[PDB]
Amino acid sequence: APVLGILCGGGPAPGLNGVIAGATLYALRLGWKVIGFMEGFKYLCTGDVDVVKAHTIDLTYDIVSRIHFQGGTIIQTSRANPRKSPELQENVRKCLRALKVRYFLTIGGDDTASSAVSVASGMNGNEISVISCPKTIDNDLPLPADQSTFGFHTARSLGMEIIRNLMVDSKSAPRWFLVEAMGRSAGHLALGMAEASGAHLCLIPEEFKQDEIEFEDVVELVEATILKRLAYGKNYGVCVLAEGLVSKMSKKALYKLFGNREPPTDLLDDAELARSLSEELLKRLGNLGIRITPKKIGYELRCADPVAFDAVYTRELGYGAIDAFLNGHSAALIVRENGQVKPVQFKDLLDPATGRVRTRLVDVTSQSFKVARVYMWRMSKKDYENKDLVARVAAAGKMTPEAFTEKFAHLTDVVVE
Amino acid sequence: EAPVLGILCGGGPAPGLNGVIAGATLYALRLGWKVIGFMEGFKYLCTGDVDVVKAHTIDLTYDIVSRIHFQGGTIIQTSRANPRKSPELQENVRKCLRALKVRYFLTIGGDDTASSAVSVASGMNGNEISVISCPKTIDNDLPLPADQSTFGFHTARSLGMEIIRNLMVDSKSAPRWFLVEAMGRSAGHLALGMAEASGAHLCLIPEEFKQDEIEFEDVVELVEATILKRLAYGKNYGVCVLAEGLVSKMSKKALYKLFGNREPPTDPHGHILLDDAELARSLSEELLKRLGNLGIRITPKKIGYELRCADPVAFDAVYTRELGYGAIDAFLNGHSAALIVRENGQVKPVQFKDLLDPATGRVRTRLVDVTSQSFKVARVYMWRMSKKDYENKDLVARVAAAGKMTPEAFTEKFAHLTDVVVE
Amino acid sequence: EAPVLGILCGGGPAPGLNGVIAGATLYALRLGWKVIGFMEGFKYLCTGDVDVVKAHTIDLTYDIVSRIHFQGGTIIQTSRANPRKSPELQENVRKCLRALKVRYFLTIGGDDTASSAVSVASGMNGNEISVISCPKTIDNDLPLPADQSTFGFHTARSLGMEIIRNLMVDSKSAPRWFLVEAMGRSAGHLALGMAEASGAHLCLIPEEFKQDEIEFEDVVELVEATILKRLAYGKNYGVCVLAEGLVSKMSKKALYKLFGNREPPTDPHGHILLDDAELARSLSEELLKRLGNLGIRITPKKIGYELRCADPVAFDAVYTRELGYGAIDAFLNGHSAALIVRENGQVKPVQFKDLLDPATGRVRTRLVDVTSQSFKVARVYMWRMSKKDYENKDLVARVAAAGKMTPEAFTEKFAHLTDVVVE
Amino acid sequence: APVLGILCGGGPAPGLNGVIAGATLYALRLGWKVIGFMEGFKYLCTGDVDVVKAHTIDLTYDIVSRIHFQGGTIIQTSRANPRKSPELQENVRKCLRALKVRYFLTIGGDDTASSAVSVASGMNGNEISVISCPKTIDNDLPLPADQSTFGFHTARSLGMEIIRNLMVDSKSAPRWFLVEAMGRSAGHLALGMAEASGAHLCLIPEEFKQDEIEFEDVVELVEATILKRLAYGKNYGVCVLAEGLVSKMSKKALYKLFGNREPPTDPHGHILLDDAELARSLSEELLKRLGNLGIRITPKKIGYELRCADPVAFDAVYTRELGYGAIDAFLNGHSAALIVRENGQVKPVQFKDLLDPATGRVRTRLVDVTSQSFKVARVYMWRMSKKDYENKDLVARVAAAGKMTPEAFTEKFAHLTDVVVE
């Protein structure tokens, strides 16, 4: 019987097990033998067939019959990447041929897919067919607008539930939480959590007009919302910040971010965006009775058990991968568009400028973004022109209306309105 | 004086009602509108007594609605009272709305609620009152573009999956079969959604039966074949999800057997009382006679009212916020007698008459599309005897032996089921 | 070779079984023991065929059990197969245990499972095998010191509260009364726990009835009084929780009315089949006849099997870890024919004789203590007519008016209920 | 009718609303008037009765009938503390008499109870009765042993569920998470979450023998656990750290903790331990020492998301009984008492019985590291015990995993048996 091998690459997302079971269960009904490589390409890169065998397992019906309820991945994952070296690529080719892998399914991000195509192109098309399923919790695949990637629904819903507790806590014991939503790629995850939870403010890189963000502008955007809420008798709230703000900041802004120190280098992971904003905002607003606390919402989302939408989603993706193999497809991506799972050749999705799959960002011109902005607390262009409103907000900050306009009014040219 | 927006809910609750109320109210308050809410739908507006209506209306303020987007249910309650049947009731609703000076009237409910809103509007001047309705259903049976859900459906399906997950673990830990009955007779979207997500071994919905009337025996035998095939693979346990809508597709003879070889119950006006039917219990009793000797135990379980007021999941929280905003946008843009729906990621008003089915006069009902790729994929992961499975004699021998019957006896009893349901 | 520890589960699952299996297995593996698990309790050990047993036993390794403490159910399954009835079966179990060289034998189950283990142990030499059983019950009906829970109860009560919370929101959103039936006939701990936690308006458990046999009419009237009092305060909705144990206290006459004025269903041996009873449904049908004219609708809801394999809450995860450790400690200290229980914060073995009730030959059943302060506190927050309430003429007038009857009729019908249930 | 005034103090815990609803509903059945002070003692300390009146609300049936489902507190809370000044204490007394509060219920932890008594001793017990309910997710009130404070079960259960997700993620994508469990008073919460979730290590201040912890010892306790797992083929795990380790650290340890800088301080000269990042600092050090071995280490805080979770059934029943017991203590003439539950009975316990004689403040209940429960929890942790350090084969295996000689490993790590109880 033909052999199907499955591996995972990248960081986990809810529903990985859904894809593994959807592909494996269907393939077993076709009589295929299914194996799974542990930790992605990590051991295939060695080329030692004894080492690979010690870290491959037989994906049987009993193993995969009930993993669709479970977060994470039963065959683990790694970022091991054979595309960098031709020797590593040939080590992967050597082990796959030894195991007679006829069909090769990789579940991972663009890096995982790129490794799969690199191994396949140097291989004969008759012996092995390679398909990859694109995975990302950031919802940044170029699907038709409003169509989500698998894992995104689970991450956003658990994120909403965490922020709900912080909304109740900020009101019960007045304070502001600056929630930092992990992920520097796009603003989908931060905006989704914020809109669902009714957070009072959300800042994503996509809403900044200029190409580089300044640290001062971020502080003042949060500061204006805090003062406006304070002008309405509320000294508390929650503000959600996409970590992607950091990767759009200028060199000078990063210098201030790291404590007016030189930024570390080989390193945006060491940045503490929410904490730095908390310290500065306490200097400016602590005298008003405002306390500010940072909180990151990251790794606890990646292996949450999938919500029903992702369980259905990944089952259909697993079926679609096996279907593509049966129809002779190779070097393709299993994606779902308009309710249909279809193979899509890798380059058809690539951005020529990047060499990687195109990144779908938040469309800040869409009606959905404007609707989300409507329910946020913020100072618009019209608000700065409202003399009564500006007087109350400035008074809340214990400064003159002229001083408030002088400091904050320019922000209407910093972010889309 | 500021314009008055009045809000009411009709029908059975679905998760996210408060989200629509909070979206419409918060935006309206930013526009300076005064917002009021009618308790229990059309119940008191139908009386025509303005004192009774005022005793059951409340002021929807910022403080009230600021955090109800987290909460299931509806803070202004709901009712199925329907003024559309009588012109006296319709004029009573108009009399009370004019008394309260309602400029904008938003109803959140099913088709009966939307129709009542439109009937009240036709007798009213378009300048004095504008009427918008937001379509709500956990059954997902609105005619939106295919694969796009109605609000509350995602919450109901996700909680349904979690309950069935416990029953899946319990069925395997202590071998048994659960017949889960998914509440809702309109369509099979909810039953199939829960079953596919939870990996249930079988799902039966009215949409997959080719004939116009289902027979009670055919339902029993479809489950029986699934139980036996699982038993042929060493598994004497499972979970089967049944859309309650099977009952409403059943023939007269089938309903007689369903109610215990009794005369089906009827209401005072002659409508058969299908709420008193217990599909999962009746099928379990029949299957226990046939399969108990094999070591099979079967238990019914209903998944109903615990879904309706579950707190909305993030998808519905965003959905109902966008719908509430869209209701206010439609009022500002002069629309009336329209339904706020979301299509391809855009919330827009759609005129009520544009959504009617001309043959019926009512809003068209979207059922499960059993020819779609989604339904075929769901069917693949179910345990069942396909057309090809009945022709595989090695398989038929193993299943027949599991049921303690001859291969010829098995073919005679069950093979006709391939003409009962689409394959 | 290393000592062999064999583990099986019997009876119905409870949350935390896997915690006990992992607690015993992890500690034993650190001691160098070999650990095996029998699938489906005594089911295959009863055959006596050692090849059949080996095909349904698995090696409990570190990798198998390292993370099952998060998971409900039991990875080695369970059954109610019971070898105590026959020594032909008991000796079949003895034959397989000796073949597998089981030095230590741990069973997690009810009284049948514990008794089967000791019966098999009595025929074996004390040097070759030591037998320990961990008592399991989600009903909280073990004779622990009062207010101390059995493992699995905290999880079941908490999930039950969450279900009733959705029904409390739904009953208020769309006015109705839910009659929630908490499955389990041994005691009222589970029904009373869910009701108190969720703030349900009424709870009825068999333990609060003074007489030895309950009448169907009295149960109907106790609910009826609560509905009327709530109706007298403007609330035409609520939730009432009923322990299924009420059925097992009902008189012969009461059971006749319960089953539709029919002869109660019976098994082949002539014993009544109370599982076929539908307590919540029958009470709902009767209460609708009496109260439908008042605008009351009533719906039943069962809370049963979805509790048994829910993932354990933190209290049960810690509990079952300590029980698993205590079983291995008991083996190390030479105990046998003992029950591993936790009392006053200490896991200890307790000899079977200390817990058996001589009148029954089964472990003593701890029921709700209706004289305790905890029960009185729970009753305070219920809606109900007390002795003092019936003597309040102003209150009786309002409740009777809510029921559309004279105060004399109300007192004549309902006042006797103060002698039916403890006050 | 008599007036019952209710306030919440301290950080929120799940079930505050349960106490408010239990006390308010029963008091309303007795015909009492119930009011609630917003934000604890914050406004009562001003002495301005006009301001206090603007921040009190009438606790009615409709307000409280269904808040037993809800986390947080509808009357908010604060750490405002009249205990510090006699000037403030008289301000609270002045406002309470002005509002004619006969019964005064405070819902909070040890600091809140102590503040209530300071107000109580200068007031007549007949004129005003002051009762407090035990609130803390830190479980550090001096209740009868094995009896939890309310909110602890909810916090521990949500903590278990969060750590479960981190457990699946650490195994799926091998890494170590250093979870920092908020709370410096005691180790009940950190140890509870770790035990329920099967975390590989838990460090609480209670298990350190010496009075002052050294930063190097904390780093090495985690390092030994990581290396031992590495010796068994596991390069991933979860370690739970009580934030209270920070408050036991010596002056030198705090200097290293804040980046080899002088610790930040408030205007009075006390160290600002809130600015410390225990898990982050340990992660940086351990990545330097172990990154080459294939170890990735990430810090993670489990704090504020626990405090206002909706209560679990145990806390719902608990706080319902506590609110009832508070009203019962009022009816029976008790004052200056704490409502506690022991053997299924809610009873008042006079405040003085709970004071620590050396301190004058409410005694703080810590983890009893000699108890059987702690020993059982420790057995399921990954760690090097005294007997493990004396096992020559084990030491060779772990040392090889850490790429060091057995002699080097013994020199560095064996002294830890005198650092922490065994």
Ligand SMILES: Nc1ncnc2c1ncn2[C@@H]1O[C@H](COP(=O)(O)O)[C@@H](O)[C@H]1O
């Ligand atoms: N930026 C904002 N976002 C959301 N709501 C707001 C904002 N500013 C004001 N509101 C609310 O919208 C309404 C505006 O009314 P007013 O400020 O009284 O003209 C009030 O209910 C405010 O609390």
Ligand SMILES: Nc1ncnc2c1ncn2[C@@H]1O[C@H](COP(=O)(O)O)[C@@H](O)[C@H]1O
């Ligand atoms: N109707 C079905 N649905 C899902 N899986 C099945 C079904 N029938 C058989 N299987 C599984 O598919 C695989 C192929 O079975 P076989 O017919 O033995 O080749 C085995 O793992 C079976 O348990």
Ligand SMILES: Nc1ncnc2c1ncn2[C@@H]1O[C@H](COP(=O)(O)O)[C@@H](O)[C@H]1O
């Ligand atoms: N049986 C009951 N259980 C709980 N609360 C009640 C009950 N009866 C009345 N109440 C409430 O107790 C308060 C005082 O009642 P009353 O003495 O009638 O004014 C009101 O909030 C009533 O709604």
Ligand SMILES: Nc1ncnc2c1ncn2[C@@H]1O[C@H](COP(=O)(O)O)[C@@H](O)[C@H]1O
């Ligand atoms: N410190 C520890 N805590 C918990 N389990 C352990 C520890 N050390 C080893 N184990 C496990 O306990 C068993 C004892 O292994 P050994 O004593 O080396 O044969 C193996 O399953 C190990 O994985």
Ligand SMILES: O=P(O)(O)OC[C@H]1O[C@H](O)[C@H](O)[C@@H](O)[C@@H]1O
């Ligand atoms: O009940 P088990 O044999 O463990 O398997 C349960 C199976 O149920 C369904 O019918 C699906 O085909 C599978 O996705 C699932 O694995």
Ligand SMILES: O=P(O)(O)OC[C@H]1O[C@H](O)[C@H](O)[C@@H](O)[C@@H]1O
């Ligand atoms: O991380 P794994 O090796 O899969 O196992 C995780 C282990 O962690 C803890 O430290 C306990 O010793 C075990 O109860 C648990 O199984």
Ligand SMILES: [Cl-]
């Ligand atoms: Cl200073």
Ligand SMILES: [Mg+2]
């Ligand atoms: Mg404290």
